[PDB]
Design a protein around this ligand. Structure first.
Ligand SMILES: *[C@@H]1O[C@H](CO)[C@@H](O)[C@H](O)[C@H]1NC(C)=O
Lengths: 52, 438, 49
């Protein structure tokens, strides 16, 4: 037994284990970008997504 | 009526569209890709499997002579020796210092278990697609299946709907492949009649039980040993077992776009990529005259709440006034966001709540109910959970994630000093003339 | 869902908070400190009388 870290893109990722049917897992964005009418560090969210 | 529209390749993602005709309510058309079926063109080259050698009873001439004949057996070989004294339990069968001669021969054939352990080399080409669609128009459902080629319309209710060609061709299959026990391995096998000892495909056959067979695996006979009749032989290990130990992983775990691949058709399924155009013909009977459809009045758009997410996490509210009862479809004329439901019961002055999703947190767009439409602007937030495999990105991003606040900061940011520069130049010219006055 | 919040140390004082989720009504969460129990670590040294 151990642990493994797998990066997942926005598109989607497949996942297999054991001898049973696999499960597909994708991801989205959750960084704190949008402001609330006050000065904010929005850039960080836009930095978390597409550093380019 | 007739219409056309392009849809991305993806399974189980209903798309809702509208057909607009003056005097007729705009029908809501629902399009779903039930499944995909990519079937290429295949050619069988030859079979292979573990081989069993043959060591036939030797041809021994007691005090005479022999020779090394020829035969059609695969890997057939012969070799002769002289001055041999073979022995056996009853004693020595024959001894003649020079006149004795021994002749041995060797060949090979597919092992009996091959019948089920056999693998096959396939030449593939010209990937072709077959697509199953479910199309609903005015609570009129239809299940159809057709090729993506622009010529053939699939038959469903005798409604000919054309689609394709594919926007971009994708094929995980290499021109050469191998198949074994329900698995497909991408490999570059050698040509028929081309063999190498210790290499894959050392033995070939047009059929699993074809009498004709050919191979080459470096079988050189060995001289007889001391005093005991036998046939010492030599040959290189089967390339089948070697390739098995190092065949590499199956294509099932390496194909892009999550292809599901099966062998007996040698096809892929539920593998999504690209976009497809579609042409759709519709009977005018399915269409409904506008007067028959209800009319609406002074409808307002109200966003109860919306969090940017992957599922139908956006919620909206609508207040409407109508002079008629019945049903109307709803649509999001802006691509960035898409609803989840098509229509609902109407009322003289009732109001409804709607689900939807979007590719941007900026909920600024227009949405149509019956034939009329109203604008809807708001801000949605990113979610906490960020890992899910359920349908998502139903709409691709269009660099519209840029918030209105960011646009506000950018607009007031970019300078316009060039206008000040031009004013400075003009006043410079006027002052230069004034100086020229002197 | 998950949430976090700080509360002062005090017994029998319900605090009412909200968890906000688009598409879901914000549930009212009530938190009460029924009792407190501070237990240190003890070592016996010797008896006397
Ligand atoms: C479809 O809707 C029309 C009215 O929009 C109705 O007259 C018809 O009965 C419906 N058909 C079905 C199968 O529900």
């Amino acid at each position: 037994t151990t642990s493994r870290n797998f990066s997942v893109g926005r598109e989607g990722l497949e996942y297999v284990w054991g001898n049973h049917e696999p499960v597909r897992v994708w991801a989205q964005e959750s960084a704190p970008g949008d402001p609330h009418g006050w000065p904010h560090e929005i850039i960080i969210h836009y930095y978390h997504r597409h550093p380019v | 009526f007739e219409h056309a529209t392009t849809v991305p390749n993806v399974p189980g993602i209903p798309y809702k569209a509208l057909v607009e005709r003056a005097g007729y309510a705009p029908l809501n058309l629902e399009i779903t890709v039930v499944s995909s079926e990519l079937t290429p063109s295949t050619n069988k080259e030859y079979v292979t499997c573990k081989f069993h050698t043959v060591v036939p009873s030797p041809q021994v001439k007691c005090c005479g002579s022999l020779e090394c004949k020829a035969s059609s057996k695969a890997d057939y070989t012969c070799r002769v020796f002289g001055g041999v004294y073979p022995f056996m339990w009853g004693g020595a069968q024959c001894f003649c210092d020079s006149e004795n001669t021994q002749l041995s021969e060797a060949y090979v054939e597919f092992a009996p278990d091959c019948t089920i352990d056999h693998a096959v080399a396939l030449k593939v080409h010209t990937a072709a697609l077959k697509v199953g669609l479910r199309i609903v128009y005015g609570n009129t459902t239809a299940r159809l299946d057709t090729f993506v080629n622009g010529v053939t319309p699939g038959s469903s209710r005798d409604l000919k709907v054309i689609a394709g060609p594919i926007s971009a061709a994708f094929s995980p299959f290499d021109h050469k492949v191998v198949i074994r026990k329900g698995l497909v391995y991408n490999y570059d096998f050698p040509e028929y009649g081309a063999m190498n000892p210790g290499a894959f495909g050392d033995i070939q056959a047009s059929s699993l039980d074809a009498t004709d067979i050919v191979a080459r695996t470096d079988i050189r006979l060995l001289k007889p040993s001391v005093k005991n009749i036998h046939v010492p032989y030599t040959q290189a290990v089967s390339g089948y077992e070697m390739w098995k130990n190092n065949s590499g992983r199956p294509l099932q775990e390496t194909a892009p776009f999550g292809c599901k691949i099966e062998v007996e058709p040698l096809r892929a399924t539920n593998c999504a990529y690209g976009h497809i155009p579609i042409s759709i013909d519709i009977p005018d009977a399915a269409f409904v005259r506008s007067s028959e459809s209800p009319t609406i009045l002074e409808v307002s758009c109200t966003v109860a709440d919306c969090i940017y997410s992957a599922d139908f996490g956006g919620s909206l509210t609508l207040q409407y006034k109508a002079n008629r009862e019945g049903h109307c479809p709803v649509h999001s004329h802006s691509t960035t966001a898409v609803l989840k439901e098509a229509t609902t019961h109407v009322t003289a002055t009732g109001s409804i709540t709607l689900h939807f999703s979007t590719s941007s947190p900026q909920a600024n767009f227009i949405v149509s109910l019956c034939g009329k439409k109203t604008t809807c602007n708001a801000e949605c937030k990113p979610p906490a959970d960020h890992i899910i495999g359920e349908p998502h990105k139903v709409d691709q991003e269009f660099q519209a994630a840029v918030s209105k606040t960011s646009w506000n900061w950018l607009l007031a940011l970019f300078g316009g000093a060039s206008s000040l520069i031009v004013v400075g130049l003009i006043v410079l010219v006027c002052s230069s003339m004034l100086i020229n006055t002197r």
